[PDB]
Each structure stands twice: as structure tokens, then as C-alpha cells.
């Protein structure tokens, strides 16, 4: 019921357009769902969005974050026969977005639909030309969205070629709300931050991204996977010690991996977790399951007392 | 005497495991070391240790640095064979490890032997299975550390397969202490920054304008293990000109053999002067060496260096 | 006891340098461990010995045998700036010795340690030397031995794991075996030769079974390895049949294998071979493959001739 709510809120977000570079939208669809809230607002210089619930100890300071921005395509040039050639955003493999549909938004604000094609464009537009795609509105700069084909299956999986990485959005989010519904007391104060590419009060002692990742083997999209390293090197180990602790205490099915293909500049330990996925970067799915598990870590986490 | 006992402390310090992540035994080792010395000492929330040394100048400071945490893997599956595979903590290549002894380190601090093979650990324990290998403790996630073979030489040679920068670590600490016993002022504070995260990551007094790492690299060339050497430039881009001037210059004034080198490995956001020395290794990353002497030129020329003035 | 005290031996025999051409030493190491035993010592123009025990028949002989000799290299050239350049001793491959501690024996015996890097494979010596000259002035010469650090090590597990062994774990079978049939005084049905042989990497006319005791080639560490055939060629099959019979009767674990790279072409004997299980001939074997080993050429030993 919670579990699917969260759910529902994935959808959500997915189904907004934020492809890294042009979240606007989206970061203004999250202030308003949280406006009533009784949770601290704070939009960045950079339209990142901060979200701070007071704790019990304000001298030292909890961070998580989650990032709304996503995958996406931009118009690098449109060719004289009127299709669309397009510059990567993110890190995918073209392969995995032949025939994807996509929308391509305008600086005036106007959308078009289109299909990805092998890498091309075909837009859904009577235009034969370049002056006729400019008359469009449409010219190099725009943003390109991939269509994420967002379904929620009756056995309980999420399936979409998003979840990078509205998953965890949506979990910080449902989060927020319950401290509030149930008048929980956070130990410290705890800043939410929702990125929007792939700054922190001084006072922040630990640092937990809540993400998701690729293997290289089996993934597991039951249970909350915590992560032990990622292509930048090993997370804090006793951070990370903490975090299983938590899991066994509160018995939240876990998995210890590491990502290969995933700050330090802030004395601040980090750790991560996140729901596990599958097929990453592609086309993506996890399971209710995980994502309740992820949900009831992320709160044993947040109750916690800061590592010794 | 020194530079033999300089040595002794390598040897030492090469002799705890304590790869990128897995940092503590080592740096509380080192905490107690220094613990009955004048050195102000400090840990950051990383885990690093910061060592401080006041100085006539306290408005104007000098960092050395140099690294503790050391090449090494992590468990990243259990085979069901009952063999292990591996993740790579660092920047080297597997052959330079099929058939190193290793120690497998567990949640609870238990440990296990085992031997690379080409990538996974046969360890030393009878045991045939994934579950088996479980009921040792060892999970995904753990420690593994590369037996470093260190060996000191009559000749006054150091070597190991896996020096990583314990080397420079040990001149820090003697520098350290021969301030101390020797009733040397510094002219400026000057804090000495035990890492232990190679990139790497600081956090450091505002005051600070120097910025000197303690480091060895490879050539392309072929190394000099008979004198410091003193790097131009590296992967990041040329250091400072002018303070890398000044340092040829306390070598040449002292007497100090030194070599001017190019280390195409191994950066700034911190408004400070930086530069990168240390003692010459050979075969660096893969088996590493290096010689009395070169450590002996090493120890001279950081002296020098933060007994000088800041270059104007 | 008896098991461990094995590996006591074993370890002592590998931290003698030994490689095939250069085995002196280890040779007169033997020699003298025995000195004091009840068995005929025969050393030979190549250099082996051969210890011999009397049994009830003395027409009809048995001959085990395990080799001393090792891997090894020898200087080849020494090179412009000083290091050394290195010929293999042996069928071994390159890679498996990169960084690996060595040492070299000079003419007059002295001997510099060393390490292995990269057939263009050299040695870095631990000498301040910058040229031929200053290395041959050390007394090192083309010709020269070189032996590669053992890494020996005995684990509180059971585990003996070296980058050596292949063979001398063989040998300090024998040599204890031969020590044991002293001690407890029964009688070999037969006069038997123990071999200890020094050219096995690079005897009597009554001869009838000719047993190597020798390591091969997803193993097994825990049972004794009895070999069926190697690339010369399927082993006795009679025989063979009659050393798992004697496991079988023995409660010895074993396993039957095909040594695939595993080399008396023609000498008119019946061929036999078995051994310790090893792990990658860096090499890694347990001591109950040691037990299971030495149970086994007692039995053996002990057994009567094939009709």
C-alpha cells in the first residue's frame, strides 16, 4: 500500500521529461508536491533542490541524495533531408534506444514526437528539409527525451528504460512524508538532496548516495543492494559495516556488491545503496520488493546514531 | 645509522596491509608511533591523519603529503568451487600478481592465506563450496591484501613487489622526529598529511601556500634508485615552474644527488604551489626497488625544503 | 607426527638451491642424512645416489625413484648496463617467474640475490654494478646457476605451498621410507633401489618394476595420484591395476589420472608412476595427499611381483 504509493510516484516522475541539462520541469513538479510539506525548501544556483528536515542535533548534519536528471539526446544538427542528428546525454550505448520514440522540445516550449533510428530522428511531421524543421521551432540545442515505456506489472516489478534514478526520488520523497504523517524525530539534521547531474552545510559528517547500479554477473531486484566499491574505489568501510548491521538488526533482505561501472574533496564519509535494478543503462527493472527493503534501510539509516 | 633505521621503518609499515579502503589497523599504528611526540596529530572523518608541526610563521603554512593506503582487491564473488573472485583496488596490471600470496580479511577482522592465480584466490582452508566459504566469515565485500615479500639488503637495497608510497610515509615520520630531537624551528607551520585515499581528496588550513607531494613515479625512459627525484611534470600537467626551480636549487646547494624527472602517471582546485618528489623506484607498480641512498638524498632534500623560505 | 615431520623434510630439501646441472649440494645434503642408517649409499659419475636395501630375493630387484633437481635458469649474456640475461633450465614458462627473488652462484661460490623481469627476461642484481665489467668484477659469468627463491610455506591448515616442490616432496618420501623399514626392521620381500636421480628435467639388471615417484599436471590435493599415462604412453597396465588394488586394500584415497604433459625408453623393466597430488605444477599440495603417498609406496614396497 505504502510500497505501491511509492510506486505510483515512480511512474510519476518517470513520466517527466528531465533529461541532464533541462530538469526544470521536474525539480518544479517536486517543489510543489512537497509544498505543504512541513520540510525546508531550498532551490540551488544550479536548480538542484535541497531538502532539510531539522534533527534533534543541527552541530552535525546528515546528507543523502538522489539525482532526477536522466539519459537523454540533443539536436547537433538537423540535415537537409529533415531528419535529426543528435549528441549523447549520459552514458548509454546508442544499441539500446534503436526505435525508442522520443520527444524533442523547442526553446519556445513546443514538443514533437519522433523515433530514434540507426543515429537519427525521424520526426512525426510532414518536414522535408531543414528550413522546414526550423520552421517547426525546433533548431540545434533542443532537448531529446527518450519515451521510457513506464509499466507496473500485477506480479510487482516496475519496468521501464528509466529508474536512473527516480527510483530513489521517489523513496527520499516517500521518506520526507513519513517522518512527517508519523512525527518521527531525526537524531540530526538531514539534507535531501536532489540533484540534477549524474553543495553541502559544513557540518555534514556522512554522505549516502541512494543510486543503482550495473554488475558484472548474476542482479538481484528483491533485496537492497549496498555498495562495497565502484569504479572510483572502495566506500567507507565502516560506514558500510554500519549499513549491513542495520539490515541484520532490522532483518531488510540486503546483497554487498560491487559496482564497476559507477565528492571525495568533502571530509564527509560516503556510502551508497540503492534498490537493485536489472539490465542498467538499457532497459530497466526492479521489483516491489527491493524497493520496500531500500525504503525500510534508508529509515533504519537515517535513525541511526552517527559511526564511532 | 639514520637512513638504516629510515629502512627499518619501511620495512614495518610495509608489513601491515593496508589498502585503498581498508586504512585503520595502519593509521593507528602510525597514531601511536607519534603518540609521545610534540606533533599535533588529527584525523579528519575520512580516516586520514593530519600531523602538525608549529613554526615561527603560523600566518603562512607548507603541506607535505604522502599516501598509506597501498594496491590490494576485494571479494567481489564466491565461486562455487570454493575459489574466490576478485575486484582490483588501484591502477595495476593482474600479471604483475598470478601467484602472490594474499590475506583474505573477514567483517569480524578474522583472516585467511590464499595465492593469486590467473582472476581468483585459491585460499590456504579446506574448502569446496560457496556455503563453506561463507562459514569462514568471508563475504563479498571483504579485504584482500597482496603479501608484500619485503627484503632489505645487505648491498642497502629495499625491495618488495608493493612499496606503493610506504617509503615516502617513513621519511615524513623521521623528518618529523628529527625536528623534534634535534631542536630545529620550523619557519612556517608545515602540516604533514597522511593519506589514505589514492585520486586522492584533502581538506587544509586556508594558510596554506606550498604544497609539496612526497610520491615516487615510472619513467617511460629507464629508474635512478641512487638519487632523489624531482618531477617536472606528470599525467596532470607541468608542476609549479618556479617552486620546482627552487627545489633543484636546495639540492645543488646541499649537495644532494638529484635527478629532474617526467612521470607520465599519477591535481588542483586549492590556490597553492604544488610539487612532487621522492625517492627513484625501479619496475614501480610491478616488483619496486630502491636503494639506501636514494633515500638518504630523499630525507636531505625535504629537509632542505622546509627549512627554506616560501619562493617569493 | 610422522606426517608433519615429512614436511619438515620437505621444506628443508627446498630450501636447497638444486637446479638440474647444480646439485651438489643437495646431493651431499642426502648424503649425509643418512650417514648414519643402515642402507647401502652409492653415489655416481653424474652425481646421483642410489640407496640400496636387501630383501629376502635377491635375483629379482625394485627400483623406486624420485629426482632432486629443479627449474632453474643460468646466465646467458651479461648485458650492456649490467643486468643479466637468463637461459631457462628446464620446461617451465616465462611469465610464471616474473619478480620473483633469485639468486646466483658464482665459479668460486659466491652467491647475489636477485630479482627476475621482463624469452627477453633478465635479472636486476641486488648490487650497485652499472656494466659488464662491475658485474663480472662481482665474479658472475656467463655459465653461472641461477635458482629461484622457493617462497616455501607450511600452513597451521596442512597446506605446503611453494613455486617448487615437483619432486622433492617425492624425495623426502623416499628417504623417510627408507628410514622407517630401519627402524621398525621387517624385511623387504625384495632387494630394492631407491634412486635419488639429478637430470630429471633436463641401474641393476635384475630390475623387474621400475616405480617413479613424481608429480603431474581440476587436481586433487588430498589422495595419491596414480598415474594410467603420461605423453610417452600408457603406464604398465598390470601393474597399475596391482598399485589401486593395494589403495583399495589399504584404505589409501587415491585417484587415477593422465598426466598429459608429464615426460628408460628401453630398458626391459615394468614402468610404474605415481605421486602426490599437486596443484598447478605455483604449486600447492595437503599433507594427507602426503600420508596417502607415503602409505602407498609402503604397501607397495611391501607387495610381491605380477605373475
Same mark, same amino acid.
Given at each position: ?8 510516484? !515512480? ?37 538542484? #533542490? ?95 527525451? *527518450? ?95 554500519? #549499513? ?21 574533496? *568533502? ?23 527491493? !524497493?520496500?527493503?531500500?525504503?525500510? #534501510? ?11
Amino acid at each position: 500500500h505504502h510500497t505501491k504509493e511509492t510506486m505510483e510516484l !515512480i511512474k510519476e516522475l518517470v513520466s517527466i521529461p528531465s533529461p541532464s541539462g533541462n530538469t526544470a520541469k521536474i525539480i518544479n513538479f517536486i517543489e510543489n508536491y512537497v509544498s505543504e510539506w512541513n520540510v525546508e525548501t531550498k532551490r540551488n544556483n544550479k536548480g538542484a #533542490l535541497i531538502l532539510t528536515v531539522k534533527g534533534k542535533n543541527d552541530a552535525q548534519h546528515r546528507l543523502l541524495t538522489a539525482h532526477v536528471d536522466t539519459l537523454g539526446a540533443m539536436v547537433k544538427e538537423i540535415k537537409p533531408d529533415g531528419r535529426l542528428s543528435l549528441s549523447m546525454i549520459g552514458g548509454f550505448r546508442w544499441n539500446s534506444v534503436e526505435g525508442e520514440y522520443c520527444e524533442i522540445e523547442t526553446s519556445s516550449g513546443k514538443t514533437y514526437t519522433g523515433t530514434i533510428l540507426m543515429i537519427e530522428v525521424r520526426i512525426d511531421e510532414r518536414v522535408f528539409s531543414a528550413d522546414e524543421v526550423r520552421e517547426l521551432g525546433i533548431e540545434v540545442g533542443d532537448f531529446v527525451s *527518450f519515451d521510457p515505456r513506464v509499466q507496473i506489472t500485477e506480479s510487482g516489478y516496475i519496468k521501464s528504460r528509466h529508474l536512473d534514478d527516480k527510483v530513489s526520488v521517489a523513496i527520499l520523497l516517500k521518506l520526507i512524508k513519513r517522518l512527517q504523517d508519523e512525527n518521527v524525530t531525526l537524531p540530526y539534521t538531514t539534507h535531501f538532496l536532489i540533484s540534477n547531474n549524474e553543495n553541502i552545510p559544513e557540518e555534514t559528517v556522512e554522505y549516502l548516495a541512494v543510486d543503482m547500479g550495473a554488475l558484472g554477473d548474476g542482479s538481484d531486484e528483491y533485496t537492497v543492494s549496498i555498495c562495497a566499491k565502484d569504479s572510483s574505489g572502495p566506500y567507507h568501510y565502516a560506514l558500510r559495516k554500519h #549499513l549491513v548491521e542495520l539490515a541484520k538488526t532490522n532483518h531488510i533482505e540486503y546483497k554487498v556488491d560491487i559496482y564497476p561501472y559507477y565528492r571525495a574533496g *568533502f571530509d564527509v564519509k560516503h556510502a551508497l545503496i540503492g534498490a537493485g535494478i536489472d539490465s542498467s543503462h538499457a532497459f530497466e527493472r526492479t521489483h516491489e520488493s527491493s !524497493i520496500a527493503h531500500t525504503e525500510a #534501510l534508508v529509515y533504519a539509516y537515517v535513525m541511526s546514531n552517527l559511526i564511532e
